[PDB]
Amino acid sequence: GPPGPPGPPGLKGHNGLPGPPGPPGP
Amino acid sequence: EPVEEEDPFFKVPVNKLAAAVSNFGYDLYRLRSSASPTGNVLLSPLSVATALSALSLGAEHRTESVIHRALYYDLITNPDIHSTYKELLASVTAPEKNLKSASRIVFERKLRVKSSFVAPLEKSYGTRPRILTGNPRVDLQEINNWVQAQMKGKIARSTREMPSALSILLLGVAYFKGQWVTKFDSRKTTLQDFHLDEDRTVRVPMMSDPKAILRYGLDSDLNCKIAQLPLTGSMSIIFFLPLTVTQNLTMIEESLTSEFIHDIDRELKTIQAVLTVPKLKLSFEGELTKSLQDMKLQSLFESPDFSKITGKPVKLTQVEHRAAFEWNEEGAGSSFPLDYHLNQPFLFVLRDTDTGALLFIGRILDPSS
Amino acid sequence: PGPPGPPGPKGHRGFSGLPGPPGPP
Amino acid sequence: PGPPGPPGPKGHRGFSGLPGPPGPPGP
C-alpha cells in the first residue's frame, strides 16, 4: 500500500535562556 | 623539513585512538604505581578512559578541551572520533577476546539530563546514564547489579555505600581470564620460591614450560629482559623482567607508552626458552579520583562546563574502578634455550594485537597478596 | 493504506533574553 | 498496507528568554 502521511508537528522549542545582567550602574 | 612516514600501524584510525587512550592508561598506571610502593598494581584503564571520553560529549569547549588533552585526542585527527571509539570498543570486547569492560556515568538523584546528550552517548558507547534515587542501600544494589550483569558475576560486589555528595560519579569495571595459545602442563606446575626482594622469599605456585617458545628481547639500558606470550583471540601479554632482583621498576615504568610497547613488539625475536610463570589471580576495588586530579584534570572537580548534559551546575566528584584478572595453565593446546623465570618483581601488559590497545596492566611485587 | 509518520523534532530553542537593566548610581 | 510515513515537521522556535537581572551599583 501507499506510504502513510508525515507525522504531526514537533513540539515548540525550549525556552530561551535568561538574559545576561545589566551594565554597572552610574 | 620533510620527515619519515609514520609507522603504518598508527595510521589506521582505530589504532591511532587505541594508542591515545592506551597512553592515558600508561599515565594513570604510573600515578597508581608511584602512589603505592608495595603490593601489586592491577589496573584496566580502558574502562576509565571510556567513561571519561563519553562524559566529554556533554562537555562544552573549554572543559571538553581538557578531557581531550588528557586522552591524547589533541594529537589525533578524526572528524568523528566518538564513532571510531564505538569501533574500538567493539573490537576489544568481542567474545574471543575473553575481556569484559564496561563504563557507566552515575548522576545525582533527580537530575534532568538533556537527551541531546543521552542519544550520542548511547550510539557510540552503548551505555545509559544512572540517575540515583537517594535511597543509598538500593542505589548500591543497583550498581552492584549493573556490574554483576556486565561482568557475568566475575567481580565482587562493593560493600561501600556511595558518598552523600555525589554529583557525577564515573565507574569503570573490567575482567579478563584469557587462554594461552600454548597450554601450560598442569602436571609440571609446582610450588617454588618467589623472591619479594634479595633477602625475603615466598613460595608461590609457578606454571612451567621448560622448552617454551616465545618472542624475546634483552633491553640493556632499562636492565630487563622482555618476553611476549600469545593469547587466544589475537592478544598477548608482554612481561618486563629486570636482571637484578629488585622492586625498583621505575625505569621500565617511566618508559611505557603505546609507541614504546609497539616498537618492542616489532623488534622482539622468536627463541626457545626455559619459561616459568606464576599463577595470577587478583582483584582491585578502589577510587582513582586523586590520581586523575593530578593528571591535569582537577578543573573537572570545580565549576566545570557540562552544559550539554544539563543546566544544573554539575561537577565530577568520584571515579571508581573495579578489576579482576586471572591466568592459569589453560590454553589451546601444544604448539640451547634461554632462561625466563618470573620469580621476582615484574611488570606485565596485556595487549590487543589488532589495535594495540592496552587491555590490562600489572605490577606483580608478590603473587601471594 | 499507510500509517502516519513520527512527530517531528522539537523546535529550536528560543532567543536568549536581552541584557538586563543598568545598576544603581 | 503500506509503510509508515515521514517524520513530521520541526516545531516552532521556543519562547524568547526572560530579560536579565539589574546590573551592579557603581560610585
Side-chain angles (χ1 to χ4, degrees):
Chain A
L11 297 180
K12 189 160 170 75
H14 276 330
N15 283 345
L17 303 179
Chain B
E1 201 134 288
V3 290
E4 314 191 319
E5 207 161 326
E6 177 169 44
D7 187 313
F9 187 82
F10 291 109
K11 303 180 63 93
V12 183
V14 81
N15 301 352
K16 181 63 91 46
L17 176 63
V21 56
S22 288
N23 269 326
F24 157 98
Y26 291 122
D27 282 343
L28 168 58
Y29 163 87
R30 274 181 282 271
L31 280 167
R32 289 311 283 196
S33 152
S34 150
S36 99
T38 319
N40 301 46
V41 171
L42 173 77
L43 201 92
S44 184
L46 173 65
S47 49
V48 170
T50 309
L52 251 175
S53 151
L55 182 78
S56 84
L57 291 166
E60 204 277 320
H61 194 275
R62 27 165 19 49
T63 88
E64 89 161 336
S65 91
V66 78
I67 305 183
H68 277 201
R69 265 209 156 263
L71 286 173
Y72 297 89
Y73 289 3
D74 42 318
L75 290 315
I76 298 205
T77 202
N78 192 325
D80 195 3
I81 178 145
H82 297 280
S83 67
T84 310
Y85 213 117
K86 176 178 194 167
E87 215 176 317
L88 170 55
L89 291 169
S91 314
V92 312
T93 48
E96 292 303 77
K97 304 287 168 183
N98 293 109
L99 170 84
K100 280 137 190 172
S101 182
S103 303
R104 190 165 211 220
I105 302 182
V106 182
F107 287 124
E108 65 181 278
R109 66 172 264 265
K110 276 332 281 150
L111 186 64
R112 332 174 293 182
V113 186
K114 298 168 153 243
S115 37
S116 91
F117 166 78
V118 180
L121 182 173
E122 174 42 34
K123 323 171 154 282
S124 323
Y125 296 97
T127 199
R128 290 62 148 177
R130 170 56 197 174
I131 318 280
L132 289 176
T133 59
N135 193 326
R137 177 102 299 156
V138 84
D139 276 354
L140 254 204
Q141 209 83 333
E142 196 280 332
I143 298 127
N144 281 333
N145 284 330
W146 175 93
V147 173
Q148 188 224 333
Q150 294 271 359
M151 307 275 117
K152 313 310 175 161
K154 282 288 178 272
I155 285 91
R157 336 197 87 218
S158 194
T159 50
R160 170 68 32 110
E161 281 169 59
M162 274 156 305
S164 96
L166 186 157
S167 190
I168 311 175
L169 176 144
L170 292 181
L171 177 62
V173 287
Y175 177 71
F176 184 80
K177 190 159 163 298
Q179 289 298 276
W180 296 125
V181 167
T182 296
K183 296 172 181 130
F184 275 79
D185 174 68
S186 34
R187 315 162 193 287
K188 270 175 322 297
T189 308
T190 84
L191 201 78
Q192 261 274 63
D193 290 8
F194 183 109
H195 301 100
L196 317 170
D197 68 311
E198 33 258 76
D199 323 300
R200 252 289 172 249
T201 319
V202 303
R203 300 92 160 203
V204 302
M206 307 206 41
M207 313 141 50
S208 152
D209 200 316
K211 292 172 242 315
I213 204 78
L214 54 80
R215 304 185 61 233
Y216 172 83
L218 203 159
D219 196 305
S220 77
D221 280 359
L222 308 176
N223 262 280
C224 61
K225 40 213 265 184
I226 298 164
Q228 179 186 45
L229 267 176
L231 282 304
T232 301
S234 163
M235 290 169 318
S236 93
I237 289 154
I238 292 161
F239 312 75
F240 291 77
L241 171 45
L243 304 172
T244 173
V245 196
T246 187
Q247 292 162 296
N248 192 323
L249 310 185
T250 323
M251 279 199 304
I252 296 159
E253 304 183 301
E254 283 186 41
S255 290
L256 306 155
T257 71
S258 321
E259 291 91 343
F260 166 86
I261 280 300
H262 178 74
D263 283 352
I264 280 155
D265 173 73
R266 168 172 298 277
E267 299 284 4
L268 284 173
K269 288 194 230 73
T270 301
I271 66 145
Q272 280 179 46
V274 185
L275 170 76
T276 61
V277 187
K279 310 206 77 185
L280 222 40
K281 188 168 185 271
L282 317 83
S283 52
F284 172 65
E285 182 191 317
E287 303 160 298
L288 319 169
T289 310
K290 283 130 210 181
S291 312
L292 275 95
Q293 272 170 38
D294 37 27
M295 243 172 279
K296 280 203 117 142
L297 227 39
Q298 194 152 341
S299 93
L300 271 52
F301 298 81
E302 55 216 28
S303 34
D305 196 342
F306 299 109
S307 319
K308 312 178 121 202
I309 291 188
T310 184
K312 206 191 161 330
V314 293
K315 179 207 112 64
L316 179 57
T317 67
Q318 289 79 243
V319 186
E320 195 195 324
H321 183 58
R322 322 201 197 150
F325 183 89
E326 170 145 64
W327 66 50
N328 61 355
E329 300 87 351
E330 303 175 16
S334 323
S335 148
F336 78 98
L338 262 180
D339 260 1
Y340 210 85
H341 308 316
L342 295 163
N343 53 19
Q344 333 161 7
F346 68 87
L347 298 131
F348 83 86
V349 164
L350 166 69
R351 188 177 101 109
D352 179 54
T353 297
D354 313 313
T355 72
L358 176 72
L359 310 171
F360 252 92
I361 188 166
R363 176 191 89 196
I364 307 311
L365 301 197
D366 189 8
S368 270
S369 79
Chain C
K10 83 172 163 303
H12 291 275
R13 171 175 304 259
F15 288 133
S16 295
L18 302 156
Chain D
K10 186 182 195 103
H12 285 292
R13 178 184 280 284
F15 285 127
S16 292
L18 289 200

